[PDB]
Structure 1
Amino acid sequence: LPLFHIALLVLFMVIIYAIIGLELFKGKMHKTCYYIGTDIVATVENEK
């Protein structure tokens, strides 16, 4: 029971940060470098 306030604070902080990130980084991570004229993503050995 005493951890209810902490959980409420955590939830509200998650909500605020989620909305801030929604306003800042919305639809920005949609470009990656494909190969020439193909649908293949170009990376190196141990790079995601």
Structure 2
Amino acid sequence: LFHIALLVLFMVIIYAIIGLELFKGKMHKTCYYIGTDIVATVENEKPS
């Protein structure tokens, strides 16, 4: 399985780097109630 290990390892690395550049630091803004430091979200929703 050595030859497949190499492949999978290099796949993750490549995608990891592409991911890096592509969306590095683009996920730091969320909706907030005005003035407060609380996150605004519906019921069964995850902060996004």
TM-score (norm 2): 0.92
Please tell me whether Structure 1 or Structure 2 has the larger radius of gyration of its CA atoms: 1
Runs of 4+ with >6 A deviation: none
Identity %: 100
Tell me: higher relative CO, structure 1 or 2? Use CA pairs within 8 A at least 6 residues apart.
2
RMSD between superposed Cα atoms in Å: 0.5
TM-score (norm 1): 0.92
Count of aligned positions: 46
What residue ranges of structure 2 are gaps of 5+ in the alignment? none
